[PDB]
Design a protein around this ligand. Structure first.
Ligand code: ADP
Ligand code: ADP
Lengths: 450, 79, 450
């Protein structure tokens, strides 16, 4: 039949799976060269991608031999501008009517420009569009990095209408009161691109969570019950909380965070009531991820429990895990730096079945972490992030994140004298030097045996 | 027991898996089957959406799916 | 002056430093493309390299952007055929008179063909020269891998005389009694190419030893005293003994091996006499490397010493280390799997100043080790050494080496029925399958915390 032929032909090489981008560019999508040959698209060509919630965007298509044939590489900005997530399916369409822009009206989002002063054009939009020939579509939201922060901007209007390429003859209008956020999450929200040095561990977590959280109705047909509990192990500041938030944001899963001390600070009975209500809310707003931080505060070993009501909380957690069904679509993530202090009853089948060890990052892993916390920072040529990673042996994710923030403050004090209060165009121009990173290394507070 | 509702390839050797899975309890072996089952779902099925019965009944779990499940497993007796 | 102008012009781009080869080929040397442009040599061209002891060879020159401009990449066979070692200087010269071979007489070395039977041509030389167009020079020695071993062959004669390229019309003569080894070390001797999974650790050791052992007269002019003692740490079978033999062979240093139990098995007084004589011999035959294996057998902690004559041996070792001078050109290498059981007095400045931790190899490091012990083995396409390294988590160098030898025996039994005794042409044809590696994995006897 007519409509049946439409729906069954949804296996066209024009329908591709959303994958991660190697190069973080808001205007560039990467495809396999055999896929672009099938779809008759040339490198550099602007394509129209249609996503979910009847939303669409225009991007530069680029050939990548590392990109899978049925997949498409796109960054978090492009992904959001299509109302999609990694693993979803979009359809790529030819875009031959992309005329250069006559004038574009762009405004920032208030929650990203809190405290920011001065002209946003010279600090952000000017170097952003400069000789880049960026495709721009009305209603889009993009992220610009620089000046110790990141600003989110909205495309208010385009001339010609709906979409145009921002050329050197395009007038960029960015005056007026910042726009207020509406039905869209922050582009600065933590994603997989914000977690470094745990490539293997991230892939493992992703495999376990993506199917139950992205396709929950799939296990209704299959008789296979997926994992419920995952135990993240690793020293403090190794990104356990980060990985959890990244996974929840990237999956669209409802994120409920239980904190070990937060539960244990409450009265007798109030801690278990809070513990139940946390599990209840997650089931109601499922697909969900319950993140139990410092899980050793709650549920320690029966030897280390020197309290009557404390043993009542360990038992409450075990039964909440047992009482949780696969059909509930809730994944519980526990985190501890003391895996051997945790009660062994949690490791039981039906509770915390799988365990991921997030150790200390190696030279390569540290360089990745250093790149993440220098994203919104202007760096000098005298800066060598490869050399810093070579020296910072025994540093965790937080130790490296603190080194960047300290080198950033050392740069603020050293370069800026009396202002009062700084404006964006001056913050975006000051560069963090190797001397600022050396000074931060000298005042730092950061081992592995067989 | 945990391959009863599963289509298995001729390349599958449950005798060889039992020879290798020394120190595995009932749950460890049950988890190995469910993991090899999911590895088969992902590897064989691309984009459906949601699967229907006649297609699920046709996909066979291979020795490669059981090898991949063995590589990611978390399983002693003295006198 | 005339002869002064010759000697001072020894900074010609034709004089290059001997570096390691990425690709192990007895006929190929790699140079930088800017160096070949300076020397007017094209890729594929046969060049004449002159080394030490008035020795020379002919190789295929190839362009490599990873090769340093003043360096040359060559394997251990080419290196030996020039009487040179890594770091030495050779001179590359144009070779335009390389005519194809009419006939070459090649014979194996006895110590490599012990127990081997059948025609060596069909098993080794035939697939070795096949469509390879190998430059061959008289007096040369080369290594051919296959049939669970490696055979060393000598180039007895060439037609045209001295050197020729072995083409498909070249007659290869290999009949007669094997030649006896003369003034040349075994090509199967352990080298840096035989040690895998310790890239960073090897580079560290090499930097510390190469200058004092390759250029000992250099520190006579400089007032800098180099390291004497190095402590290698790591579990049993992680290649500590291997690294020591590799370093000694690659440097040409005299190798004296002290064994912890060997010393401790001797009578009271005989152990210290042996310990002194070991240090004395090394000084006499210097540049030398003293390798003290199981250093914790000798010299354990003063608490763990429950013997009077045992404490006399620990003290003997400390004074022998103190009594050793930089001017002696002897480097002492200690090895232990129990670094915390070793006497802390050894770690003192003047004794064991530097410490190298050779841990357990990662997925990449294990794959390297697997490649090393499959060098002389025929492998099926069904073999996936990448997958074996993925599975063999927690395996050390010896564990992986044993897995190969077991899969090799499993192949011998499974493929060969009743022979008696096997000959070379049949051994070279039998391939080790993934089933042989699975069977070896099933019968194996192989942890890291923060
Ligand atoms: N793997 C990492 N990559 C990048 N940043 C990291 C990483 N690990 C930690 N950080 C940074 O340091 C902080 C450490 O806090 P956290 O995630 O709570 O660590 P943990 O939960 O392991 O104790 C994070 O908020 C993040 O900004
Ligand atoms: N890093 C390695 N690469 C390759 N082979 C190795 C490695 N480590 C060990 N082996 C192999 O296994 C054997 C282990 O013995 P050994 O070198 O004495 O280990 P260790 O001294 O650390 O106890 C070596 O002879 C070698 O054949």
């Amino acid at each position: 039949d007519f409509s049946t032929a439409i729906l069954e032909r949804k296996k066209s090489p024009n329908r591709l799976v959303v994958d991660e981008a190697i190069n973080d560019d808001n205007s560039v999508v990467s495809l396999h060269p055999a896929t672009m040959e099938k779809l008759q698209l040339f490198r550099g060509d602007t394509i129209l991608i249609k996503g979910k919630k009847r939303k669409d965007t225009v991007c530069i298509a680029l050939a990548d031999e590392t990109c899978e044939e049925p997949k498409i590489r796109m960054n978090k900005v492009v992904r959001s501008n299509l109302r999609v997530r990694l693993g979803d399916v979009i359809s790529v369409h030819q875009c031959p009517d992309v005329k250069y822009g006559k004038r574009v009206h762009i405004l920032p989002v208030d929650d990203t420009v809190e405290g920011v002063t001065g002209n946003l054009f010279d600090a952000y939009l000017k170097p952003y569009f400069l000789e880049a020939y960026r495709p721009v579509r009305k209603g889009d939201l993009f992220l610009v990095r620089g000046g110790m922060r990141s600003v989110e901007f909205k495309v208010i209007e385009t001339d010609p209408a709906e979409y145009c390429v921002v050329a050197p003859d395009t007038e960029i209008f960015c005056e007026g009161e910042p726009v207020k956020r509406e039905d869209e999450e922050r582009l600065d929200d933590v994603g997989y691109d914000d977690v470094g040095g745990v490539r293997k561990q991230m892939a493992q977590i992703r495999e376990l969570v993506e199917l139950p959280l992205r396709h929950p109705q799939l296990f209704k047909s299959i008789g296979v019950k997926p994992p419920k509990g995952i135990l993240l192990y690793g020293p403090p500041g190794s990104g356990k909380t980060l990985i959890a938030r990244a996974v929840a944001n990237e999956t669209g899963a409802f994120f409920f965070c239980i904190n070990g001390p937060e539960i244990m600070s409450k009265l007798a009975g109030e801690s278990e009531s809070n513990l139940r209500k946390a599990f209840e809310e997650a089931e109601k707003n499922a697909p969900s991820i319950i993140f139990i931080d410092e899980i050793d505060s709650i549920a320690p070993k029966r030897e280390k429990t020197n309290g009557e009501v404390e043993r009542r909380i360990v038992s409450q957690l075990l039964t909440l895990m047992d009482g949780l069904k696969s059909r509930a679509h809730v994944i519980v993530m526990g985190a501890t730096n003391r895996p051997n202090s945790i009660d062994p009853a949690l490791r039981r089948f039906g509770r915390f079945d799988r365990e991921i060890d997030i150790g200390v990052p190696d030279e390569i892993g540290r360089l990745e972490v250093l790149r993440i916390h220098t994203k919104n920072m202007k760096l000098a040529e005298d800066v060598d992030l490869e050399r810093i990673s070579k020296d910072t042996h025994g540093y965790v994710g937080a130790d490296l994140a603190a080194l960047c923030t300290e080198a950033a403050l050392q740069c603020i004090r050293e370069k800026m004298d009396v202002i009062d209060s700084i404006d964006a165009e001056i913050l975006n121009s000051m560069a963090v030097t190797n001397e600022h990173f050396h000074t931060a290394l000298g005042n730092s507070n950061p081992r592995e045996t067989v």
